[PDB]
Design a protein around this ligand. Structure first.
Ligand SMILES: Nc1ncnc2c1ncn2[C@@H]1O[C@H](COP(=O)(O)OP(=O)(O)OC[C@H]2O[C@H](O)[C@H](O)[C@@H]2O)[C@@H](O)[C@H]1O
Length: 168
């Protein structure tokens, strides 16, 4: 399919980036898949997760609570596909490593590998916020791992400007 993604800078054959709120991009484009930067408990408190969940009027959290009750926590580096509610067809919840809490940064590659199961994704930079991975590192792992088409929404203007001026 052709989506209405607009205003993205090309990074590579398959990776595109924009200074935008992922919630607003999802609302406008209604992509097949929006990626959440989750924790293993799917407790969507802040950052991307909290903003996505609020935009679903808490439906994402209610669904997530049922998922955990049935299946238990995700693995670090793991994922699950749930509804995208009013934002997207699906939300791919992906758990990057919580580097600030001692988890292995190498698991960020495993996390991004989940994206390869989907032809097109709207996504954030995993682990680059409250989980404490260096943002440029997360971008480089994304570029070096994801082979499907990924549209990265970077909320923070200062960060975007730095990332797009950095080697990959
Ligand atoms: N609305 C947004 N749109 C786009 N990018 C955003 C947005 N909000 C933040 N970012 C950027 O998105 C990037 C990721 O920041 P984070 O969302 O913290 O994800 P993590 O993987 O580091 O931490 C996961 C925890 O975050 C939640 O609390 C979860 O529930 C988890 O517990 C940063 O560059 C942000 O500037």
């Amino acid at each position: 399919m052709v989506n209405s993604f607009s205003g993205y800078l090309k990074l590579t054959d398959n990776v595109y980036i924009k200074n935008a709120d992922i919630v607003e991009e999802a609302k406008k484009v209604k992509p097949t898949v929006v990626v959440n930067a989750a924790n293993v408990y799917l407790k969507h408190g802040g950052g991307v997760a909290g903003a996505l969940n609020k935009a679903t009027n808490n439906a994402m959290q209610v669904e997530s609570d049922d998922y955990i009750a049935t299946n238990g926590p995700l693995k670090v580096g793991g994922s699950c596909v749930l509804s995208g509610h009013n934002l997207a067809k699906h939300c791919l919840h992906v758990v990057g490593p919580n580097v600030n809490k001692g988890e292995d940064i190498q698991l960020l590659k495993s996390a991004y590998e989940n994206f390869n199961q989907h032809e097109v994704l709207l996504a954030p930079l995993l682990s680059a916020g409250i989980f404490g991975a260096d943002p440029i590192h997360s971008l480089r792992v994304c570029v070096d791992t994801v082979r499907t088409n990924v549209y990265l929404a970077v909320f923070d203007k200062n960060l975007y400007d730095k990332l797009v001026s950095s080697f990959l």
